[PDB]
RNA sequence: ACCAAAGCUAGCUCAACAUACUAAACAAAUACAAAAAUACACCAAAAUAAAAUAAAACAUUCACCUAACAUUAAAGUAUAGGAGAUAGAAAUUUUUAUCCUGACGCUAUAGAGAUAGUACCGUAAGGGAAAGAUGAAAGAAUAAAAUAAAAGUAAAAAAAAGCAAAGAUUACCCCUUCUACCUUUUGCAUAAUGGUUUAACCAGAAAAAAUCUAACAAAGAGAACUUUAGCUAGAUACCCCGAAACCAGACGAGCUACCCAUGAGCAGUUUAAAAGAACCAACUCAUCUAUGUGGCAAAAUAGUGAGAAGACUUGUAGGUAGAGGUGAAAAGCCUAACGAGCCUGGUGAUAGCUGGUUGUCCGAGAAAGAAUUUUAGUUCAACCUUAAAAAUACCCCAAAAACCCUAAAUUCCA
RNA sequence: AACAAACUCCUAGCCCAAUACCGGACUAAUCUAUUGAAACAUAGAAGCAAUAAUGUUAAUAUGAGUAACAAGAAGCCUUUCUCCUCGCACACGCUUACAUCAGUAACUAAUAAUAUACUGAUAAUUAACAACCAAUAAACCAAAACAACACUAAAACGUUUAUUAAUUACAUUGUUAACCCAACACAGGAGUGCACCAAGGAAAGAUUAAAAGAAGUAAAAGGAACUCGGCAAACACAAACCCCGCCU
RNA sequence: ACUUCCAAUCAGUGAAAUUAACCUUCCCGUGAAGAGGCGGGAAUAAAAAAAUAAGACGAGAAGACCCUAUGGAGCUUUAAUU
């Protein structure tokens, strides 16, 4: 009989079995049967300029490392918002109702790169 | 498995005192796991038993068997080792004292027959053991002569005793 | 009755 | 006979033996003669009396009934005005 | 005439008869898959 | 019938370890203790076998009655089948009847 | 001398406690034909358990049989039962917290199937293995030591004659004597069954009544009972393999039976013809013969045959599923065994039937009368075995036992 | 007379056969509690003993080195000769078995040579061919068979109009093979389009030419006298009579 | 009569049913009633290779014919419960 442990790929079936190998789609089917490719569906690699970049894939061997201190939400908040909140509270202009001026986003549906829905691949 | 023919060649005798006759050299060699069959190799082993090494090589060179070449190679290796390792001069002064073939480890396969039946096909392997002794070959035993036969008959007649008598 | 005995194959591992 | 019950694991007894037999504590078993109510118009007075009389059982039948019954039926009973209380025991048996 | 070749392979028939979807589309096939999972089978279906 | 060719390591068993020295020390706890505790309470083992003894059928029946509500599926099935087989064999098979 | 043999570990088994119970991985993809990112829906379903078995048959019945109330008693009691086999309570009673938990369980044919639900076998449900051995160091293989002990061979083929041996003998045979062993039978060397051999596994299990020993005794027992020498405790006892079958639920129409879609083939010749016309190719079947019969083949090869524009052959895919399907009825075919598939579970089904049933020695030791759907079997009696009480037991002269005639001789008796 | 027993004496004793069933005394090998410590004793336990189940597993023998199996020839070594002709591709199916190099003592070829079938390393199948590749209403009775025109069994196969169809190079997938189903490198089963060779291969490992067996060719005179039957074979391949089913 | 496949020898690889152990003769008689194994006689250096099949009540399949089973199952009913 046929195998069962082997993977069921597109090479193991008839002509009518044309299964994808995992690549993402890049368009749809047009009018006369051709494939219409959508430009926005094709990823655009945002590659920076490395001409003046003074860093290398390897570090110096004598360079010391540091104690592992993974970044947490508490540390990020202390670094980005705690000084501003403290200064505003000392000044007396602090407004608990409005926090959008401090980087807080009440709703993610407005901006481009959303965090919980994860609108961006990488 | 058993490997003692190799170890039989590593024994050391104490030095011989003066006046004792010189002990003939004994050289043991063997080839393990030969594809050729056990009884078929026994035939050649019996063929080359008790003769000089040169005569054995002469017979094995013109023997048509497949095991003849294997036995010839084993004999040549034994002669070379006897000359080199053991203190044996006169490379032609050896005779085949022992020449035996045993069975090794076999392989089991399927032999298809018909009507969905099968048999157990066995892939045979054999070992060939040879022992060479320095010196001229011992003479072949002659058939018993009429004088010897009469002597033994007369001796058996004289050996009679009156049984259940005393 | 037409009684027939189907042959049984030995396991492939031996 | 159920030698080992499935609920309690005990030994059971057949109810027919106790329904149609009586055991005296001395080991004897008492029974009624078979056919003592059948076709009485066809039988002589002596035969009817013989059928009416109570009879005992021999050793084989006694041992069989002992095997079928349990130990509750071989106990000593002190009934009120028992008809067979005088027969419960055996006297002057020289063996 | 001559027997023994009763198996004529075809992937469409194989997948439509013993496939994962075929097994899961019926309550009894789900029981078959559960039995295979309990036994620990490497392949639950074709 | 091939037998081993080497001496087995001689077990150095001592007769004066804690268990062997205190084996059954309170076996007379009741008799010498103004009865409160039976020697039943000193038996350690399965719940359905503490201070009880019976043949295989009785043991199976007692196990099913006592701890049968906590047995696994296959264990309970095997116990039921063993009970049925033992019942049939003991009540229908044998010589002395 | 080969083949080989021996390790002690991997791990398993049975219970106690226990947090309170579908482990870890889950970046992406995973019920499109699973591991295929992305389009306007449809989703869900319940309706008793049956039978194998026991009642020596089988129809009412047949404990457990994947539903909680546990334990000591009442109690195998009341009751229910072709009142048969068997089934079987309740009212009412007893149960003091925790540690003291490991093993008179196995050691690679054992213990889980497991090195693993993996290889492999099936279309599928499903079934399901075997396989490890050195050493402190192999970053000590011009490597070191223990057994060289099974069957099978070699070293080392045989010399009249005989179940292969024994009595022996100066001496291997030559001489004399013995019809292999289990099982079944009236009886087996029987030409009745079984076995090539070796190794490892493989088959008697229960305490009611009884016997023996011991404790205490008109009382015994650590609670519930039995007691006109009895109560309590201990030791003495009752096998293994094998059907055709039956029931329930899954899996099967990739072969085949018949349909539904979608396609494809039939060249040449004779005929106003594509006429279920004719000759004959491809193609489809399989009449006869010969080979083959563990074969090329679990249905073939060679020759020879029938149809060959049709009720035709054929590819792909779908449907009809077993108390059924399908059938131009052959009781055909339904994945090589179909008077009704296969797998799993009931299931260690049940067999009055066959086979097997493993140390030594000693004592005694049985050939059949009656019932019986019974004569292939059981239960009694008569015999017999093991213990214990006793006293007459066989042999038995007279005398005695029927009337028309009647032998050997019987019964009962000092 | 003599020779002749499980009979009976003689000399010593441990001082009289046995199947089914029954009773008794010892006892091999394990574990435990105490002794013992060159392997035991008294007790308690059992997975407590195999010359026999067409017993299970593993290994071994006999049959037996038997049945059976295979490669055309020479040569300058892969070049020429002698023969037979199921070849190329696609679909379905297998999944790397395909290609290069290297090795084959042994494992696969039922044997070698070496290699498409074994081993290791490295590479490979590149889209134009094929797969995925519009709906909503309306006009539409008029067969394919060279289709002019018809027969009956009444026959798959389509355009146009109107409304909406993201609109912008390059998407994804199948591309090897000597291969699939039959336990096998199996004389079997396999759809379609092309041609009958311009493509595929080798019946023989080497001898001798016993019996018997399979296949073929030929055979004097006779021509079914063989046999159940003219089965088979043949330089024949024709004409008749019945039984049963009308016929395919 | 002659060729091919077979066959026999040489070289390579190499199964199956079967097998209590065989040191495995013939005649007559006996015997569980058809003897290689018993009794009375004859025969008898030991081993290969090739052939033929009379026997080993030859191998194969726990006879399918017959009977038994208080064993099944298919079918039919004017069998019994429904
Ligand atoms: N019924 C019965 N069978 C016997 C008797 N004696 C021997 N047998 C049977 O006869 C056979 C053995 O025969 P034996 O060895 O007695 O000559 C066995 O089947 C055995 O049971 C007996 O007395 N009665
Ligand atoms: Mg498979
Ligand atoms: Mg594909
Ligand atoms: Mg394809
Ligand atoms: Mg495009
Ligand atoms: Mg086959
Ligand atoms: Mg063999
Ligand atoms: Mg064999
Ligand atoms: Mg098959
Ligand atoms: Mg019954
Ligand atoms: Mg019965
Ligand atoms: Mg019946
Ligand atoms: Mg019955
Ligand atoms: Mg039931
Ligand atoms: Mg009633
Ligand atoms: Mg009745
Ligand atoms: Mg195991
Ligand atoms: Mg040996
Ligand atoms: Mg003799
Ligand atoms: Mg006799
Ligand atoms: Mg008998
Ligand atoms: Mg008879
Ligand atoms: Mg006979
Ligand atoms: Mg006989
Ligand atoms: Mg018989
Ligand atoms: Mg016999
Ligand atoms: Mg037997
Ligand atoms: Mg036999
Ligand atoms: Mg008792
Ligand atoms: Mg029934
Ligand atoms: Mg279908
Ligand atoms: Mg179909
Ligand atoms: Mg035509
Ligand atoms: Mg026609
Ligand atoms: Mg043909
Ligand atoms: Mg011909
Ligand atoms: Mg033809
Ligand atoms: Mg024709
Ligand atoms: Mg015709
Ligand atoms: Mg039925
Ligand atoms: Mg039907
Ligand atoms: Mg008919
Ligand atoms: Mg018929
Ligand atoms: Mg079938
Ligand atoms: Mg049975
Ligand atoms: Mg009977
Ligand atoms: Mg005796
Ligand atoms: Mg009796
Ligand atoms: Mg008298
Ligand atoms: Mg008297
Ligand atoms: Mg005498
Ligand atoms: Mg005597
Ligand atoms: Mg002991
Ligand atoms: Mg045992
Ligand atoms: Mg043994
Ligand atoms: Mg047999
Ligand atoms: Mg055996
Ligand atoms: Mg051989
Ligand atoms: Mg040969
Ligand atoms: Mg032969
Ligand atoms: Mg041959
Ligand atoms: Mg050839
Ligand atoms: Mg394949
Ligand atoms: Mg390769
Ligand atoms: Mg080879
Ligand atoms: Mg290609
Ligand atoms: Mg040849
Ligand atoms: Mg010939
Ligand atoms: Mg001829
Ligand atoms: Mg001719
Ligand atoms: Mg002629
Ligand atoms: Mg004639
Ligand atoms: Mg004639
Ligand atoms: Mg003819
Ligand atoms: Mg003619
Ligand atoms: Mg003719
Ligand atoms: Mg007709
Ligand atoms: Mg007509
Ligand atoms: Mg056999
Ligand atoms: Mg002889
Ligand atoms: Mg005779
Ligand atoms: Mg004689
Ligand atoms: Mg004789
Ligand atoms: Mg004479
Ligand atoms: Mg013969
Ligand atoms: Mg014989
Ligand atoms: Mg015969
Ligand atoms: Mg026979
Ligand atoms: Mg029979
Ligand atoms: Mg028959
Ligand atoms: Mg019949
Ligand atoms: Mg009967
Ligand atoms: Mg029945
Ligand atoms: Mg009626």
From TrEMBL, chain A:
Location (main, coarse): mitochondrion
GO function terms (MF aspect): structural constituent of ribosome
Binding site for Mg(2+) 2: 10, 13
Protein's UniProt keywords contain Metal-binding: yes
Source taxon at top rank: Eukaryota
Binding-site residues, Mg(2+) 3: 10, 13-14
Binding site for Mg(2+) 6: 13-14
Pfam family, one: MRP-L27
Binding positions for Mg(2+) 5 per the UniProt entry: 10, 14, 17
Keyword Ribosomal protein: yes
Subcellular location: Mitochondrion
GO biological process: translation
InterPro entries for this protein: Ribosomal_mL41
A GO CC term assigned to this protein in UniProt: mitochondrial large ribosomal subunit
Residues annotated to bind Mg(2+) 1: 10
Alphabetic keyword roster: Metal-binding, Mitochondrion, Ribonucleoprotein, Ribosomal protein, Transit peptide
Sites where the protein binds Mg(2+) 4: 10, 14
Entry similarity comment: Belongs to the mitochondrion-specific ribosomal protein mL41 family.
Protein name from the UniProt record: Mitochondrial ribosomal protein L41
Organism: Sus scrofa (Pig)
High-level lineage: Eukaryota, Metazoa, Chordata, Craniata, Vertebrata
From TrEMBL, chain B:
Gene Ontology CC entries for this record: mitochondrial large ribosomal subunit
Record's keyword annotation contains DNA repair: no
Residues annotated to bind Mg(2+): 122
This protein's UniProt keywords: Metal-binding, Mitochondrion, Ribonucleoprotein, Ribosomal protein, Transit peptide
GO biological process, one term: translation
Subcellular location: Mitochondrion
Principal place of residence: mitochondrion
An example molecular function term from Gene Ontology annotations: structural constituent of ribosome
Similarity remark: Belongs to the universal ribosomal protein uL22 family.
Protein name, entry field: Large ribosomal subunit protein uL22m
Organism of origin: Sus scrofa (Pig)
UniProtKB/TrEMBL annotation, chain C:
Compartment list: Mitochondrion
Function field: Component of the mitochondrial large ribosomal subunit (mt-LSU). Within the mitochondrial ribosomes, required to direct the nascent polypeptide toward the tunnel exit and position the exit at a distance from the membrane surface.
Family: Belongs to the mitochondrion-specific ribosomal protein mL45 family.
Protein name per UniProt: Large ribosomal subunit protein mL45
Organism: Sus scrofa (Pig)
Gene designation per UniProt: MRPL45
Automatic annotation (TrEMBL), chain E:
Protein family: Belongs to the bacterial ribosomal protein bL34 family.
Record protein name field: Large ribosomal subunit protein bL34m
The species this protein was found in: Sus scrofa
Gene field: MRPL34
């Amino acid at each position: 009989g046929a195998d069962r442990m082997s993977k069921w790929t597109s090479k193991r079936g008839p002509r009518t079995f044309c299964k994808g190998r995992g690549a993402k789609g890049t368009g749809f089917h047009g009018r006369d049967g051709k494939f219409v490719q959508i430009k926005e569906m094709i990823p655009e690699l945002v590659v920076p300029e490395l001409a003046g970049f003074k860093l290398k894939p390897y570090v110096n061997y004598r360079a010391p490392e540091g104690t592992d201190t993974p970044l947490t939400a508490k540390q990020l908040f202390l670094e980005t918002a705690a000084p501003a909140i403290e200064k505003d509270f000392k000044a007396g202009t602090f407004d608990p109702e409005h926090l959008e001026k401090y980087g807080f986003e009440p709703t993610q549906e407005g901006k481009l790169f959303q965090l919980y829905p994860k609108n961006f691949p990488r | 498995i058993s490997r003692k023919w190799e170890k039989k060649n590593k024994i050391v005798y104490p030095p011989q005192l003066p006046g004792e006759p010189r002990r003939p050299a004994e050289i043991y060699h063997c080839r393990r796991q030969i594809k050729y069959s056990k009884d078929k190799m026994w035939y050649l082993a019996k063929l080359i038993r008790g003769m000089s090494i040169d005569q054995a090589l002469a017979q094995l060179e013109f023997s048509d068997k497949k095991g003849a070449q294997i036995i010839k190679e084993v004999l040549l290796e034994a002669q070379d080792m006897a000359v080199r390792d053991h203190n044996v001069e006169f490379r032609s002064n050896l005779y085949v004292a022992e020449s035996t073939s045993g069975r090794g480890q076999y392989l089991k396969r399927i032999r298809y027959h018909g009507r969905g039946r099968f048999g157990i096909m066995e892939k045979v392997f054999c070992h060939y053991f040879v022992k060479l002794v320095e010196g001229p070959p011992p003479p072949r035993e002659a058939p018993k002569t009429a004088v010897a036969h009469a002597r033994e008959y007369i001796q058996e007649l004289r050996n009679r005793t009156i049984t259940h008598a005393l | 009755k037409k009684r027939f005995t189907p042959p049984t194959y030995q396991p492939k591992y031996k | 006979v159920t030698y080992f019950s499935s609920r309690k694991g005990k030994r059971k007894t057949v109810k027919a033996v106790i329904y149609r037999f009586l055991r005296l504590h001395s080991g004897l078993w008492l029974r009624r003669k078979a056919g003592y109510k059948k076709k009485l118009w066809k039988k002589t007075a002596a035969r009817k009396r013989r059928l009416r009389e109570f009879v005992f059982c021999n050793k084989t039948q006694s041992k069989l009934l002992d095997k079928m019954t349990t130990s509750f039926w071989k106990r000593r009973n002190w009934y009120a005005d028992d008809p067979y209380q005088k027969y419960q025991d055996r006297t002057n048996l020289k063996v | 005439k001559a027997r023994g070749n009763e198996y004529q392979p075809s992937n469409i028939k194989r997948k439509h008869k013993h496939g994962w979807v075929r097994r899961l589309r019926t309550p009894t096939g789900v029981q078959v898959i559960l039995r295979r999972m309990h036994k620990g089978r490497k392949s639950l279906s074709h | 019938f091939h037998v081993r060719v080497t001496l087995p390591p001689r077990k150095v068993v001592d007769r004066w370890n804690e268990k062997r020295a205190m084996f059954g020390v309170y076996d007379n706890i009741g008799i010498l203790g103004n009865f409160e505790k039976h020697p039943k309470e000193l038996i350690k083992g399965p719940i359905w076998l503490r201070g009880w003894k019976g043949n295989e059928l009785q043991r199976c029946i007692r196990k099913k009655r006592m701890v049968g509500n906590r047995m696994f599926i296959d264990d309970l099935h095997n116990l039921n089948k063993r009970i049925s087989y033992l019942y049939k064999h003991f009540n229908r098979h044998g010589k002395y009847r």
